[PDB]
Ligand binder design. Structure first.
Ligand SMILES: [Mg+2]
Ligand SMILES: [Zn+2]
Length: 311
């Protein structure tokens, strides 16, 4: 923890969302410093009116952002702070440009932004087995989103750390509700759960029966939205997506955790067809203004497929 970094961040001016380009679905962070990503994150909380509605003190929000960033591992090629930051930025764009904000309560928005920023906390890389030391070595197949429970645990620890309590201003009831939504939001990032619930979502939509007013359906939508944001690197402009695919590959093969480009195109096409395309199609139906995520995903499939056919 750099007291210098905190002082620096807390005293800095925070440019507008438009100046920071965070309202753009095509947003990239390659040109940004860590400080710049922290400032963008402050703007996200501010423009979603979370700072006002829940009386967050500036220094506390600043300290919390820095604690979150610090608890991601910089030696992990893809699953690091930049991934979480980008997941949060997609959530912001989906709520604003995507116009999903007016469809949710203030607590759901608050929880979704916190969850997006915290969903992969302390990730050690996909090529590194997550070991649950608190369970028997022969009985470690809970598969009940074990790593995600760990990410949530990390999130709660930071939310409760001295000087980092950004939810201090909520009443006890609001606090319990918010924690519950954050927890379900983080667990939703387990792709296994996404695949398990995909069916309902797609069916409900197929029959114009999707009712966001239904508590069960709304919870379902929040889970789908988290997945859409977690996977959004797949919708980025071509040069950015190539870079992001490169990072994932590195973490997977070169043990960027703690044959290649040649196999990447086929792999991205497969992932787009098996998981991504349908999700963004469904999201666009919920909110047409989310179309650019779908457009971006389709454009990338064609680019990767072309390379797959070897140019
Ligand atoms: Mg994850
Ligand atoms: Zn993730």
């Amino acid at each position: 923890e750099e007291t210098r970094e905190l002082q620096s961040l807390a005293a800095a001016v925070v440019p507008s969302a438009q100046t920071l380009k965070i309202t753009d679905f095509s947003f990239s962070d390659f040109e940004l410093s860590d400080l710049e990503t922290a400032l963008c994150t402050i703007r996200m909380f501010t423009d979603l009116n979370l700072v006002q509605n829940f009386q967050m003190k500036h220094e506390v929000l600043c300290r919390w952002i820095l604690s979150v960033k610090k608890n991601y591992r910089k030696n992990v090629a893809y699953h690091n702070w930049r991934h979480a930051f980008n997941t949060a930025q997609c959530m912001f764009a989906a709520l604003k440009a995507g116009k999903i904000q007016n469809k949710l309560t203030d607590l759901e928005i608050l929880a979704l932004l916190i969850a997006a920023l915290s969903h992969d906390l302390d990730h050690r890389g996909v090529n590194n087995s997550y070991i649950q030391r608190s369970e028997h070595p022969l009985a470690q197949l809970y598969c009940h989103s074990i790593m995600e429970h760990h990410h949530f645990d990390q999130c709660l620890m930071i939310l409760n750390s001295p000087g980092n309590q950004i939810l201090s201003g909520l009443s006890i009831e609001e606090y319990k509700t918010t924690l519950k939504i954050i927890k379900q939001a983080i667990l939703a990032t387990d792709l296994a759960l996404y695949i398990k619930r995909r069916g309902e979502f797609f069916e409900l939509i197929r029959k114009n029966q999707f009712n966001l007013e239904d508590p069960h359906q709304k919870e379902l939508f929040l889970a789908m939205l988290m997945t859409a944001c977690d996977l959004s690197a797949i919708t980025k402009p071509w040069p950015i997506q190539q870079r992001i695919a490169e990072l994932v590959a590195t973490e997977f093969f070169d043990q960027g955790d703690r044959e290649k480009k040649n196999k990447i195109p086929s792999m991205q096409v497969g992932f787009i067809d098996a998981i991504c395309l349908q999700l963004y199609e469904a999201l666009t139906h919920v909110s047409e203004d989310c179309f650019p995520l779908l457009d971006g995903c389709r454009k990338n499939r064609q680019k990767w497929q072309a390379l797959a056919e070897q140019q």
